[PDB]
A paper describes a structure:
[[name]]-hydrogenases represent one of natures’ most effective classes of redox enzymes catalyzing the reversible reduction of protons to dihydrogen (H2) at turnover frequencies of up to 9000 s-11–3. With their low catalytic over-potential, [[name]]-hydrogenases represent excellent models for a regenerative and likewise economically feasible H2 production. Their active center (“H-cluster”) can be structured into a standard [4Fe-4S]-cluster ([4Fe]H) and a diiron site ([2Fe]H). Theoretical studies suggest that the most probable PT pathway comprises of strictly conserved residues E282, S319, E279, and C299 (from surface to H-cluster, numbering corresponds to [name]), including two protein-bound water molecules (Wat826, Wat1120 4XDC19, chain B) located between E279 and C29915,16,20. In this study, site-directed mutagenesis (SDM) is used to investigate the PT pathway of two [[name]]-hydrogenases, namely [name] and HydA1, which represent the largest (M3) and smallest (M1) type of monomeric [[name]]-hydrogenases, respectively.
Corresponding to earlier crystal structure data, for all [name] variants a space group of P1 21 1 was observed with two copies in the asymmetric unit cell (chain A and B). Conservative exchanges (e.g. E → D) maintain the functional group of the targeted position, but due to other structural differences in the substitute residue, will affect the precise spatial placement and configuration of the functional group. In a highly ordered system such as the well-distanced H-bond chain of an evolutionarily optimized PT pathway, this should at least affect the efficiency of the functional aspect. Variants E282DCpI, C299DCpI, R286ACpI, and E282ACpI were only mildly affected and showed residual activities between 30 and 90%. In case of E282CpI, a substitution for aspartic acid shifted the optimum only slightly to pH 7.5 while an exchange to alanine or glutamine rendered the enzyme most active at pH 7 and 6, respectively.
Numbering used by the authors: 2 to 579
Write the structure that this text describes.
Amino acid sequence: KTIIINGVQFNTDEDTTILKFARDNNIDISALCFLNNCNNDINKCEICTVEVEGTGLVTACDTLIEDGMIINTNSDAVNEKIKSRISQLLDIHEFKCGPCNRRENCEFLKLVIKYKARASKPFLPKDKTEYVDERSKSLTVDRTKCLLCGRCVNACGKNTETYAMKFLNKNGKTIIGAEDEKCFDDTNCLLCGQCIIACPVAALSEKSHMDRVKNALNAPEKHVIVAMAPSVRASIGELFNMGFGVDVTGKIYTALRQLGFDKIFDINFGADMTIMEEATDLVQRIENNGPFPMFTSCCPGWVRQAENYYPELLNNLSSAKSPQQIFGTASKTYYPSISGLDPKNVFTVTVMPCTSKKFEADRPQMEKDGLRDIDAVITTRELAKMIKDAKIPFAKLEDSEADPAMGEYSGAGAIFGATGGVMEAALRSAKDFAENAELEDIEYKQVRGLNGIKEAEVEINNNKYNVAVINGASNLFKFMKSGMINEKQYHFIEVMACHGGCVNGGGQPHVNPKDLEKVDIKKVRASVLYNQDEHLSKRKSHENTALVKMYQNYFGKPGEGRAHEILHFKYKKSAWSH
Ligand code: 402
Ligand code: SF4
Ligand code: SF4
Ligand code: SF4
Ligand code: SF4
Ligand code: FES
């Protein structure tokens, strides 16, 4: 073929789009509607408009390149078209970058600044109670910001295949939301927040728990514990312009101490706990040989998915609480027993890459003695804001350490944040448990990677068992619907709602669609975790000294009596009715 773009001739044989072919060279083409190799098929943004000699203005997103084409990307007509579309977008956009939370990384602001567009009538409503949906424990919607972009809808479509995010005809207007515009919590939505991740504006956000944190930090009698997720230490640095794949653990600890937090712990400790329990009940599930298989229950999105699509699998879920909740359970029981704190005056805060964790911490039965397990959950973005508003020079902070009592962790817990991490961590301990032997080879590298469905065979104590790692909700839907589950007898299965693991959660830093061509965000984020794993001396959850101490002096032996009654939570399917 022969292509002419801006006068320059290209000879190629690639069968792609104009946008892609131009971006594989250095021809700039603005785009808003195009993401995840999909565009809004109904009201196309036409931001990627170019001019094909003989045809006219076309959208480069969904236009295949052909011989004889002469393309213009910056002719007068093209830019008047784009400026037109952007102005039209501004006509329904409250561009009060006044207190906006997408200010420092908004794509729409970038487009407006680029083409210098202005609205014909500035959109400024008296009340916004009509445009705002904050009923959800995990999600908030601000339609004063929405561009009717479709990117959220497509993202939900391809990450979950649930279509919990729909287009809706709300009394004349076209909006986005849930089934019958009810609250997301009340639908089949997984609250995985991958809607937020694909959103270019402040239209979709996480339900904020920041004031919840401050009102505890300023409360005199309130002793505020804080513990972060595995992924956070490998992601938050991005929001402070530090680059991709940077370990900022010590910096995080320092910032948390500078924010007024009374105790610095880590959710990886709880990941080690979850491994203790889960490996134990895996083995007592072994020489019972049932009920097989056993699914992981640490991902709240996968939990909600099961409840809404496969409740007959709820009994096959592990009764062991997720790292967050199993940490919260110990911080209100065991931690006062080694600190002398009135447990009622204890306030546990987790830093998460997830948004579903909010819905998981506000579950009615996540209590004992009236006391919550987790009182507040903030995301990576929330922690970043909370740091910036305190004007804490994060990128230049020196490294601290957490508090060891429930803060130190093993390499097994360190890789939870990746897909296949829970699998590997569980196997390392379960094998030693069943064989009564401290094995040396602990790296299970078949379950790693970004493949959708991963399968492996392992032999625990001279007997072979089949394990599977599901990487993404849509992949769970595929794994079940395509009958792969009823192929071979599976024995242990890991499911993560977000493709790539928790490192790609709904509460993670928004990455520009023009840094994504450069960086494999999932692998780059996971790299830190996998390195932390190997450079740690203790690489198994039952090798965490603090955890062991905890188990001997409070919980007793795992999977039993005390440990079972306090540290576990099981899901019950609704009984048959009509
Ligand atoms: N609780 C919990 Fe987990 C742990 O530890 C996080 O904290 Fe994950 C991460 N990173 C998230 O969000 S959840 C499901 N499993 C694997 S990792
Ligand atoms: S969401 Fe972005 S474009 Fe919209 S007002 Fe806020 S900063 Fe400006
Ligand atoms: S909420 Fe965001 S991603 Fe979804 S259509 Fe509106 S602007 Fe696009
Ligand atoms: S949280 Fe997940 S399932 Fe719910 S609308 Fe967003 S992408 Fe879809
Ligand atoms: S995979 Fe991790 S970040 Fe995504 S919904 Fe599950 S727990 Fe949350
Ligand atoms: S980016 Fe091509 S129509 Fe939206």
